[PDB]
Amino acid sequence: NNEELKNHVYKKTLQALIYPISCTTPHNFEVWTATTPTYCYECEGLLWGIARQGMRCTECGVKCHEKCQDLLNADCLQRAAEKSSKHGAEDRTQNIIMVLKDRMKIRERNKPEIFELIQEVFAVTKSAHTQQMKAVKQSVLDGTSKWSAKISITVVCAQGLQAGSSDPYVTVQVGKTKKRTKTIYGNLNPVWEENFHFECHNSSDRIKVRVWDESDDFLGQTIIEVRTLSGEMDVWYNLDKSGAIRLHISVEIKGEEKVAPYHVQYTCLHENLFHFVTDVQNNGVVKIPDAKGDDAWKVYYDETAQEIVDEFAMRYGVESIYQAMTHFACLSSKYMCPGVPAVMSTLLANINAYYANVSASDRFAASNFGKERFVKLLDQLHNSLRIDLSMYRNNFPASSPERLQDLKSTVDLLTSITFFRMKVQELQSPPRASQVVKDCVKACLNSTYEYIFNNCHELYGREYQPSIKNLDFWSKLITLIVSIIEEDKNSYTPCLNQFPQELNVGKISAEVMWSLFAQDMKYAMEEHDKHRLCKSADYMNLHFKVKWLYNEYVAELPTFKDRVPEYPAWFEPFVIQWLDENEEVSRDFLHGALERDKKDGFQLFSCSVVDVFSQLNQSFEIIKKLECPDPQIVGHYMRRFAKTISNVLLQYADIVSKDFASYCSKEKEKVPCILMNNTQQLRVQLEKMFEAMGGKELDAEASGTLKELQVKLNNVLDELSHVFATSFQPHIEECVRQMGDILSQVKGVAQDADNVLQPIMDLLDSNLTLFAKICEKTVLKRVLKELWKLVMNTMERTIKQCAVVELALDTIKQYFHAGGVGLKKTFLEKSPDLQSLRYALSLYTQA
Template sequence: MSMLLANINAYYAHTTGLSAVSASDRFAASNFGKEKFVKLLDQLHNSLRIDLSMYRNNFPASSSDKLMDLKSTVDLLTSITFFRMKVQELSSPPRASTVVKDCVKACLRSTYQFLFENTYELFNREFQVDPNEPKRDPEDHGPRLDSVDFWHKLIALIVSVIEEDRNSYGPVLNQFPQELNIGQLSAATMWSLFAVDMKYALEEHEQHRFCKSSEYMNLHFKVKWLYSNYVKDVPPYKGAVPEYPAWFEPFVMQWLNENDDVSLEYLHGAFNRDKKDGFQKSSEHSLFSNSVVDVFTQLTQCFDVVSKLECPDPEIWKRYMKRFAKTIVKVLIAYADIVKKEFPEHLKEERIACILMNNIQQLRVQLEKMFESMGGEKLEEDAANILKELQQTLNGCLDELAMQFASSLEPRITISVRELGDLLLAIKGGGQPGTLNQPAARNAVAVEADEVLRPLMDLLDGSLSLYAQSCEKTVLKRLLKELWKIVMRILEKTVVLPPMTDKTMMFKSLTDNAKNLAANTKIEDMSRMFKNRMTGKQDMKQALNVALDTIKQYFHAGGNGLKKAFLDKSAELQSLRYALSLYTQTTDTLIKTFVQTQINEDLAAEGQEGSVGELSIQVEIFTHPGTGENKVTVKVVACNDLKWIAASGMFKPFVEVNLIGPYLSDKKRKHATKTKANNWSPRYNETFHFMIGNEEQLDYFELHICVKDYCILREDRLVGVAVMQLKDIVDKGSRACWLSLGKRIHMDETGWTILRILSQRTNDEVAKEFVKLKSDIRQENPLPNQ
């Protein structure tokens, strides 16, 4: 090279003594010796390019003198490029920066190839090796399917090259600051070569998966570190979504799948430890136990791992969050299932029961925090919906536990309410409507109400104080809601509407004698069956209303308990108030309500009990055009296939037709046919007439038709019953049909409520008659006549 430089300098100087640049201009213009000059330039240019293409070998970074030679070489290459442009007069001459960049790239490619082929040897030479690292086969030079160690070492070598280019060669090769940054070029070139090999290697690993998922995750973090620290801000990668997350997606999903089992196993261990320790509070100020903390510590650690991947691909990140959401669901649902299974065992230990409910509430709180950590409202819709559904599931679980806990207190509440009822019965009476407007009367009622409430308040004071100290606020409110419902329901069923103890027996299939006897209870015994204790009803109602207001205030707790709107609108309170209001309604109004609401009285004949025969009947309605009064004509035609065993050997069936409705106390309400001896399909062809005034519409009237077996010495026995509502006949004016006979009539809760109330009106003949008809039920095994 020195000989080439000497010849060129002599050629420049010539005989004119001009500078090199001036001489090149002169000789280029005259074309004197041009061929020789161009040849010399080409030889020098090629020699310099070869040197630069191996700059890492020819100009080692460890030598400052060599680095200065490198700088001079680039300067000379720049001059040569300029000379060639002048002499050869090229239209598009290559720029010096482009030539240098191509040389650097060539060197980087060969460097990467050398690193790849000699990774283990170079790494052992450049870095301190772990003495515990297993010995490697000397013939093993490249990557393997059962290990990812090769790639960790290769990344370390790549980084050392990039650092060397950035820190040692970059300050030297700075002649083209706008066109060549060797540190960036080194990072971009190395990454482009590494990315191809890494991608193909991971595709092969995906098929075999000989390594643990944790090893792939660690490699993922190493690749992410390489890209984030050296590549992401250099052209052409700056601002672009990188490809490397897609290479690792299968392995991240594998890790997340495996984490499900790990998390569930951890959950069971945490709960068992918690149970062994007696579900102690996790800290002095918390109301939940350690297992909840442990569970979310595990989930948070898992989420932190995925988060630290800092996945730059939004679509892949969405898939990770959706998959992790499913992990959360599995773990929290499993925890909730364990608590639900264990909960009945701890109902008697109220402290533990409260902590378990608090634990479910804390799951909801921590789930909300994790939801926010995962992106909150910006979280991908599928993942967000999964977590929102889980929140609703946990909400339902907490409701279920609160109901179980409150239900466990029901026997104690029932005892207290019964005592309350006894005190209520002790009120002497004498109160009249409107007396509450008088201060003395109001005070008297308030005192009575306080005394009446004492048994219930004693129970609630002790229990609710404990719950207020032991329960999270949300849990306490749920408990209060359930307790409120229970108290209202028991008040209604025990005090306002005394329980019908034989109702169950009357409504079940009557298969034994005991049930038959209970079902055949006479109307004279109904008042005792229904606990006819409601004497002095007006005073009791006043006292109970005041007591209800006191109970409401207690559950409201000055704003710390349940909202007044919830208490006032609760179905249980509305039902109780409705039952109370029924006591002040007339018998006619109650019967009217019964006919209006009980539209499925014939369901018993259509259900499991089945029909016990048929009745042919014809009904006509005539309304007087002047007075508006109504005449109902009923013709009993015949019965068919009556199912009845005559124990005495004599069967005398007859049909009884009853008109039911308001304002009939002064009118004929019952007609009966003659008996037919030992005939199970008798024909009657008898006609009866009923008169109905104009006070009410015919929609509030019905025909209650019974087929009975006549007995001389005791009460006639019911064979079957059917009901026809006049509203079904009014439009056409008449109807002829066969009615299916049932063993009893069907009533809903409203019907039974009205029946209970009317049963207590023992001095009201209409009420007694109505209760007897509606409560009568067929006796399956009649006793022989006495």
């Protein structure tokens, strides 16, 4: 076949359209009474007296009821010419022949495009086409002269019969001969497999097949016209009134060079017509015909090829669903082409609705297209569409809206194949539409990621312009990943909205891309940790960029909405390094700042402290803007940074301590004071930073380090105050001997206090007034406790008489109390120095 059959189908199609069934002569029925027992042509009902009057055709001579005249199937002219042939009245035979010629000329004249189309579809020359045409014209004029055929009908089985059971048997009548099969009892899907033979010399002796339930009940019938018989047929017929019946017919006519059934011929015609209008004419594009709407899928071409397939199918008994199911199997070969997925989805939806009182899968087993054929086809098409979607971004760019439509409609066709499996083939299908599409999108994402990971620089440099010596590659890669996820979020998600609660293209994109990029980045940083050939600033910016990505696209995904992020672990060592370098820079800035402050003259606090804390706060700003979500790691950062702060401020304290015993001389009296003020300033702003780092929320180790540091600082300030008080010891000794000389003069009370205190009064007013101006609270009080200590120490080393010293003692007590600005009396009274001096006085205070 394919060469012999192709030609046979060519001939039969020509003959099928040169005289179409659309322009057929209508019978002319007049009331008729049968004088002898006749039987109706359709229902075979009896015709007799005036009580059973029928109708008669004045040209055919066919006999039927009034209620049956419309249900006939037999060309009027062909029947007439056949009758004249049975007889011999040749005059009318030729007359009718002439009228047939005329009605074929009419057709060739009116619609000549059809026959040239047939010519080109089968690639037949003009000459041979005219000869073969000329031949079929005459074959139409011979509907009896050269027709006879031995028929062999094997009744195989039936299905879905209407009864709660039945005992069906089949009767097969040709012309006068009538036979029947065995009876199967209690079976609505029986099997006969009975063979019969028939002679069909006539032409209007149709093969009547009727199924009865064992007068008997009527279960259905199929009438097989003679025009629809070739070679060896195996056909399911729907019973007319209910189920179907399967017949295996074989025909022999005369010279039938092994003709093939008209189903096979039809698939040939449809395949070649498709392969013509698609490839040869449109060069490849599958022209999509009109639609709208209830009978859209019922149309395949325009009024120029639709006529060919339809007239071929009607005049040879090919059912509509066979047409549709062959056309689908043709489109399947052109599913990739634009606009086809849609019509294939609708077409399959109708093939699906046509098959959904017998099961659905078994009913579908009755389709003559092919039990396994159609399901194998559908399987190949499904397994093909998933391959086509596994590269959807490449095969369906977001650019062309039409291509995006072909994507949406491809997913629709896939859902329709599955739906066909769930409502027709009948079975549980683990391949669920949404989940299969999901799998395909995942595969496409993997391919895409590997593609941008193999062409990072090329693509980046093409649009926005891995190494151990450089990190630019990762910045570019992140940028391109953002591009991909943004395209999946902007274009492909609105298009693939077939499954809103199970397929959010954007979120799958985000998740997959992040996972791949995450294991890649992780490995890369684990590699960089051993080597470390780049700047800490670079690792920092990369930490910042990965952060931005995760927070922008992944953090809010259900899979990663549940804490904790994993990426900050990749970077912890590098930021540790950055903290070391930062520490070193901060020390060098401390030294450099204290040189400007010394060289300037130390102009209530100076500028070096706010400079140091400005530096440290610049450093801390970076750690705070990292917004690290892993609590243990951020706690690690604070743990490491507390050490930085501690060593910095201790460095300050040690430097000033080195230069303290040098500015205390009787020269600069503002400088030491403002230095101690600076230490105190460290003491106050440290706490501000302590709460800036969390406060009590801070880690245990770090918090411990900072408070221990606080202790240390306080101790430093104490030591400093001590050293500063020692600066005045000689002057105080002078005052104590100067008052010691007047101490002996007094002899026989209130005025004497002033005369004895005058030497130290200069110190009291002159110094406690100067410190009151440029000293901090804590600073001043420290100096006061120390100075007091040293006063009591000195007045116990050099030295009416008795009362004077005690009253003066109270006077000094009040002067150091300074009313309410200096020390508190509660301390002065229970002071260890005061009671020591009083105890010393008790030895002489006897008179």
